[PDB]
Design a protein around this ligand. Structure first.
Ligand SMILES: Nc1ncnc2c1ncn2[C@@H]1O[C@H](COP(=O)(O)OP(=O)(O)O)[C@@H](O)[C@H]1O
Ligand SMILES: Nc1ncnc2c1ncn2[C@@H]1O[C@H](COP(=O)(O)OP(=O)(O)O)[C@@H](O)[C@H]1O
Ligand SMILES: Nc1ncnc2c1ncn2[C@@H]1O[C@H](COP(=O)(O)OP(=O)(O)O)[C@@H](O)[C@H]1O
Ligand SMILES: Nc1ncnc2c1ncn2[C@@H]1O[C@H](COP(=O)(O)OP(=O)(O)O)[C@@H](O)[C@H]1O
Lengths: 100, 70, 100, 292, 55, 353, 275
């Protein structure tokens, strides 16, 4: 029954919370209102988004959306009940090892 | 922001079109020459479950488009 | 009916959202089609009864707050969430006995 | 039309008051004229002797064409890297035009919203034909010069249509005939190349580096404001001037006069002059050595 | 004491939310607030007229 | 004295306030009709006693009272821009013969436009659908804008020019509606003809989408499509299209329908340029010494305006000597030498199809 | 509280002085005057009116397109107000107060003096150019290592003897919404002319002055304005700029203002630098 959250998110779920920022903190504030909570990466499971460059930076912040959250989960703040999920096939799975 | 509101209206029509479920009535039929900017919630399960593309006319269709015009 | 039909024209009526309350007993509320106001108690419902980011009925004469209503934020978020995917459960899924 | 007088609930139109709009969009720059005449500067004469025709012959000499049925030149261009000195010169010709002048430049073609520059040029040639005969000269054409070619996307790609309407007014429309318009850039490098015509830009005059004729005379007319110890070669610079712009020569007499200042000197001398040659340009200090 | 029950009528009944923009150096503060409505305020209380500041 | 009092009695009628414009949307009962103000509030009011709803109908431009808001008077059709796009006039007609080349550009566009108007039977005699539009492009050579401008006053009948600039409309660039607002009278004044220069910058690709001002563009394109994508028959309007290049328009326009035919201009032949100088050499009188092929053989690979203007510039360069009549001597020099400078910027003029 | 007590006292005289001049809204620019009695004024509220004046305003003292005060009932002419734009990004860019004077120099003598004779030496005595002048020169050029950039400006901060000059931060010039800073660089000079010769300094002039171009696709196009737009601001005859200028950069590019500076500016000097 723990609440569920996703990643971006278009287009218009962004400024709908706040105005402008790194924009992940407000999403990190959402989980403070409801815990336990489940956060997810929707989707970036595919081999097509790679492009080997042009999709990297697009994925980099999708990769960072976990990183800065992992840095705002483990790095500092608090406390428990918050989780994140990833999905891929290959490529970025090995690029996950770059992050891992 | 007005258009953001009309794409919130697109969201508001995205919202209140699901009231068609169930029964009476609608046929939601869609067309685009470019699929780039279509949002995931526009192709959302329960919104677009069926995709028609443009099949290119070919020998049958040609001979059909050859016969139908003349 | 006529008295409330007499009351309601010379003023109108609206619905506000409290973004803050004041030590002076005033309250920070927006007139949503327009710029914000800041208005006072409103002696029936006290300050501690309602918290910022809540739906109130903006009064039309003293421009105070008439009544109290619930407000929604996550039901927009969670609907954008629940747009994407449903859930089902264990019984409705299979083959994951290893990974569950 | 515009401006029909009405008050509130009365909703009746008493009079229609002329005209148009708006503020500095109305008048880009309305000035008396340049405060000096081109007769001070020289060495570019023969080519501006060709240019001054384009403004003067519609001002006066159109009667020459009434004989044989010719129409005056509309398109004209002015260019070359500074300087040259068109910035002073392209305005300096407005003192001899005597018609009202309007300054257009790239920053004017910078548009907050869309359609203004179009509507501006629609209004600019309103106020041109309205005040005809008048003078209009534009600048920084290269700012809007290129449309890119392929998307996506340029903002001036919409404002290129202001130029295309400026073309459509000089090509697809007759009324642009009067109030001859001139253009200028720092360089002609890349723009819409189709601009060649009389309606769109026609005269292309390359202004080279000022030569020893002008180079001796330019600062001579720039230093005629100030005193001179009455021996100066003016060939010294003119012989040793290489890549030196006509504006640099204006600054050559400055720092030469600046050490004359801090020398407490009464007048400027060539030994002070010729030092200012290598003082302003070039570069260095670095070192002098292994030759000395 | 009495000032609280005095100027509350001048404040009263409600008061809006403006956006502090610019000042006439005489301390008549020209503001742009929805929609672009100005005013001129030299008022003696609660200011700190300086540091409220443009923007 | 009496006429002044008549203007006073005129003013005795003017204290009555003017009514509010309205569009009857639909109706409910004889006392209730759906109507909206131009600013968006929707109302239901009663009518006056002279009218029948057959004189109103739903979706009708009307007027209402200023207090009771009752339906009183009306007009069916109005708009600002329509007639004010009409008034551009080209000398000729005879400018037809004054464009020089080229026959299959000249003659075919007559068969593409004129004959559809007068004899649609010759289309149904064979059974062929009428072409509803035309397309120019370039600019190898030139004349896409004048040949249009010439045919407008040449072909006569009814024609309305579309100024390509102001459509953006600053705030709220929705003005693609104005094309329907223009098409509505194009369905009223029919037949009528439309020239369009610059369809390319309003031909925005949205290739790789960016910022804002592109979105209003692409949206203004969607109507142009749908207007030709009808649901409607525009055949009595003739859409003529020309611009810098026929490339960026995206394939939606590039198909027939929206782009009916392919017509263009190239560098006019020196044989056809021999004629282009006649219409240049006609209005200019000089001493009688002329060899037309001289300039044609000397000056090569030019355009009609490029030749003419420089040919007139040569006369203007030659009249700099203050002498009146000038033999081709100066012109075999000036037009030669001057266009050489003009052909320096002839660079990079060759554009895709 | 004795401040706060006297603070709520004169609201009586404020409410009595409130009724007059309070309706001076809205700040409104005029359009044209055909003859003596008539005027037409235009506002950003969307209200556009052809309307008369209050008798306290003389016709010849007023300018076209001038923000004015008005009583929107009569739509009178109350008083014209000079200022127009710009918001606090100016007041951020515009700076005041002194600090970091000469003596912080790290020993550079005539490297700073060659540029000390250009700026404060003419500013010490603008009369110095009465007799001899001719002119105080147009502009300068500065670049090198960090040491010491913008501290020579800080040196000019403390040693400024007249009015507080205006720093310029680079990445605020480049902006979205094409032409944002285009207004600024244009309009801020009149805001600098409002300070009557008070000097200006630009930082990161290499970044914002970007040169030159690539075929496609800009990108730099909207910024290709700002450079030549500043060159238009350079090509404006007046003053220019009565503030002279002082410019510090890093690399020789951008070339266009660096090849425009021989077309206008002067005094190319250099760091200092180690010795
Ligand atoms: N002989 C001269 N007299 C005065 N100014 C000159 C002279 N030669 C060059 N200049 C200067 O050169 C500058 C720019 O030259 P130019 O390239 O013609 O301008 P732009 O390219 O901006 O039209 C002008 O501001 C002008 O002051
Ligand atoms: N014989 C001619 N005389 C005058 N103008 C001509 C002639 N032939 C072509 N033109 C010009 O060519 C224009 C259309 O070409 P366009 O593509 O707009 O010019 P460009 O090729 O310079 O972009 C017409 O408006 C017309 O003015
Ligand atoms: N039977 C047909 N099959 C395929 N295309 C056709 C047929 N009839 C007309 N067309 C073309 O389709 C175009 C209009 O199609 P439409 O679907 O409205 O355009 P879009 O797909 O861009 O919305 C016309 O230009 C016409 O050339
Ligand atoms: N001659 C000098 N006098 C004083 N400080 C110096 C000198 N030379 C170098 N510095 C030091 O070098 C640093 C310059 O850094 P910075 O301000 O980043 O330069 P820039 O603004 O050019 O990037 C300052 O901290 C300054 O203290």
């Amino acid at each position: 029954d723990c609440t569920f959250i996703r990643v971006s998110g278009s287009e218009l779920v962004q400024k709908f919370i706040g105005e402008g920022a790194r924009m992940v903190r407000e999403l990190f504030v959402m989980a403070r209102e409801h815990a336990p909570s489940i956060i997810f990466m929707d989707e970036i499971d595919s081999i097509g988004s790679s492009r080997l460059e042009g999709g990297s930076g697009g994925d980099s912040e999708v990769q960072r959306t976990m990183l800065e959250l992992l840095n705002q989960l483990d790095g500092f703040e608090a406390t428990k009940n918050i989780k994140v999920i990833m999905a891929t096939n290959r490529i970025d799975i090995l690029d996950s090892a770059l992050l891992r | 922001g007005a258009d953001r509101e009309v794409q919130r209206i697109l969201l508001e029509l995205l919202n209140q079109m699901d009231g068609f479920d169930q029964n009476v009535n609608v046929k939601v039929i869609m067309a685009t020459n470019r699929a780039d900017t279509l949002d995931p919630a526009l192709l959302r399960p329960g919104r677009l479950d069926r995709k028609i593309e443009f099949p290119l006319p070919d020998r049958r269709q040609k001979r059909l488009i050859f016969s139908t015009i003349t | 009916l006529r008295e409330e039909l007499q009351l309601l024209q010379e003023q109108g009526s609206y619905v506000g959202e409290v973004v803050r309350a004041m030590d002076k007993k005033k309250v920070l509320v927006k007139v949503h089609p327009e710029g914000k106001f800041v208005v006072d108690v409103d002696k029936n419902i006290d300050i501690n009864d309602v918290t910022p980011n809540c739906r109130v009925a903006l009064r039309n004469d003293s421009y105070t707050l008439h009544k109290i209503l619930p407000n929604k934020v996550d039901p927009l978020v969670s609907l954008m969430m629940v747009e994407k995917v449903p859930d089902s459960t264990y019984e409705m899924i299979g083959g994951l006995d290893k990974q569950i | 039309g515009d401006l029909v007088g009405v008050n509130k609930d009365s909703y009746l139109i008493l009079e229609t008051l002329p005209t148009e709009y708006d503020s500095r969009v109305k008048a880009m720059e309305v000035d008396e004229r340049p405060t000096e005449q081109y007769s001070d500067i020289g060495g570019l004469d023969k080519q501006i002797q060709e240019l001054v025709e384009a403004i003067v012959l519609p001002m006066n000499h159109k009667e020459k064409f009434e004989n044989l049925g010719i129409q005056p030149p509309k398109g004209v261009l002015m260019y070359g890297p500074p300087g040259t000195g068109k910035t002073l010169l392209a305005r300096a010709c407005a003192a001899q035009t005597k018609a009202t002048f309007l300054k257009l430049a790239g920053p004017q073609l910078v548009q907050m919203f869309i359609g203004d520059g179009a509507k501006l040029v629609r209004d600019a040639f309103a106020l041109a034909k309205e005040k005809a005969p008048s003078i209009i000269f534009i600048d920084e054409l290269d700012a809007i010069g290129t449309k890119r070619f392929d998307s996506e996307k340029a903002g001036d790609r919409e404002v290129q249509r202001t130029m295309l309407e400026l073309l459509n007014q000089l090509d697809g429309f007759q009324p642009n005939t009067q109030v001859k318009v001139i253009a200028a850039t720092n360089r002609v490098d890349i723009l819409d190349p189709a601009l060649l015509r009389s309606g769109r830009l026609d005269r292309k005059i390359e202004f080279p580096m000022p030569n020893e004729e002008a180079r001796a005379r330019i600062m001579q007319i720039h230093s005629r404001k100030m005193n001179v110890s009455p021996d100066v070669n003016y060939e010294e610079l003119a012989r040793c001037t290489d890549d030196f712009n006509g504006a640099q020569c204006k600054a050559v007499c400055v720092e030469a006069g600046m050490i004359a200042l801090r020398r407490g000197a009464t007048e400027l001398t060539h030994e002070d002059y010729m030092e200012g040659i290598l003082e302003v340009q070039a570069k260095k200090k670095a070192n002098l050595q292994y030759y000395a | 004491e009495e000032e609280r029950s005095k100027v509350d009528d001048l404040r009263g009944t409600p008061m809006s939310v403006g956006t502090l923009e610019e000042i006439i150096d005489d301390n008549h503060a020209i503001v742009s607030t929805s929609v672009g409505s100005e005013h001129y305020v030299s008022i003696l209380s609660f200011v700190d007229k300086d540091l409220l500041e443009p923007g | 004295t009496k006429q002044y009092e008549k203007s006073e009695n005129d003013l005795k009628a003017l204290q009555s306030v003017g009514q509010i414009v309205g569009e009857v949307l639909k109706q409910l009962t004889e006392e209730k009709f759906i109507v909206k103000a131009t600013n968006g509030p929707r109302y239901v009011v009663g009518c006056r006693r002279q009218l029948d709803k057959s004189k109103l109908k739903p979706g009708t431009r009307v007027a209402l009272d200023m207090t009771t808001l009752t339906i009183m008077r009306y007009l069916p059709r109005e708009v600002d821009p329509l007639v004010y796009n009409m008034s551009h006039e080209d000398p000729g007609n005879v400018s037809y013969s004054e464009i020089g080349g080229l026959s299959e550009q000249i003659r075919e566009l007559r068969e593409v436009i004129e004959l559809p108007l007068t004899n649609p039977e010759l289309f149904q005699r064979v059974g062929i659908i009428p072409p509803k539009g035309c397309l120019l492009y370039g600019p190898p050579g030139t004349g896409k804008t004048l040949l249009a401008r010439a045919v407008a006053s040449q072909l006569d009948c009814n024609f309305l020019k579309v100024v390509s600039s102001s459509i953006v409309d600053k705030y709220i660039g929705e003005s693609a509606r104005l094309i329907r607002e223009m098409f509505n009278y194009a369905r009223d004044h029919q037949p009528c003809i439309i020239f369009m220069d610059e369809i390319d910058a309003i031909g925005g690709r949205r290739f790789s989408e960016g910022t804002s001002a592109d979105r209003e563009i692409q949206r203004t394109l969607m109507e142009l499509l749908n207007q030709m994508d009808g649901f409607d028959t525009l055949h009595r309007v003739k859409m003529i299209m020309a611009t810098n290049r026929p490339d960026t328009l995206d394939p939606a326009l590039l198909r027939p329908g929206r782009l009916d035919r392919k017509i263009h201009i190239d560098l006019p032949n020196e044989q056809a340029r021999l004629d282009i100088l006649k219409i240049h050499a006609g209005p200019i009188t000089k001493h009688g010494e002329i060899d037309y092929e001289a300039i044609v053989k000397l000056s090569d690979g030019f355009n009609g305006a490029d030749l003419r203007n420089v040919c007139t510039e040569a006369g203007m360069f030659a009249i700099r000597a203050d002498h009146d009549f000038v033999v081709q001597e100066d012109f075999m020099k000036a037009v030669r030498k001057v266009a050489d400078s003009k052909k320096l910027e002839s660079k990079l003029d060759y554009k895709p199809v | 509280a004795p401040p706060a007590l006297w603070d709520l006292a004169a609201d009586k005289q404020t409410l009595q002085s409130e009724q007059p001049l309070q309706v001076a809204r809205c700040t409104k620019i005029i359009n044209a005057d055909s003859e003596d009695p008539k005027y037409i004024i235009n506002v950003k509220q969307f209200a556009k009116f052809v309307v008369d004046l209050s008798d306290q305003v003389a016709p010849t003292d007023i300018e076209e397109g001038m923000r004015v005060g008005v009583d929107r009932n009569k739509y009178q002419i109350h008083i014209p107000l000079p200022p127009k734009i710009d918001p606090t990004v100016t007041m951020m860019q515009v700076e005041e107060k002194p600090d970091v004077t000469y003596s912080d120099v790290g020993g550079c003598k005539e490297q700073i003096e060659k540029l000390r004779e250009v700026v404060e030496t003419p500013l010490l005595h603008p009369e110095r150019f009465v007799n001899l002048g001719i002119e105080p020169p147009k502009g300068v050029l500065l670049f090198g290592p960090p040491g010491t950039g913008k501290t020579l400006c800080a040196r000019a901060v403390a040693n400024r003897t007249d009015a507080c000059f205006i720093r310029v931060i680079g990445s605020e010039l480049v902006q979205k919404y094409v032409g944002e800073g285009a207004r600024m660089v244009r309009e801020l000079f009149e805001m600098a002319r409002t300070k009557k010769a008070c000097l200006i300094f630009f930082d990161e002039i290499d970044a914002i002055g970007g040169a030159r171009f690539d075929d496609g696709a800009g990108g730099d196009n909207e910024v290709q304005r700002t450079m030549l737009e500043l060159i238009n601001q350079l090509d404006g005859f007046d003053p220019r700029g009565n503030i002279k200028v002082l410019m510090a950069t890093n690399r020789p590019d951008t070339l266009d203002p660096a090849l425009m500076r021989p077309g206008r500016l002067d005094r190319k000097i250099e760091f200092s630098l180690p010795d």
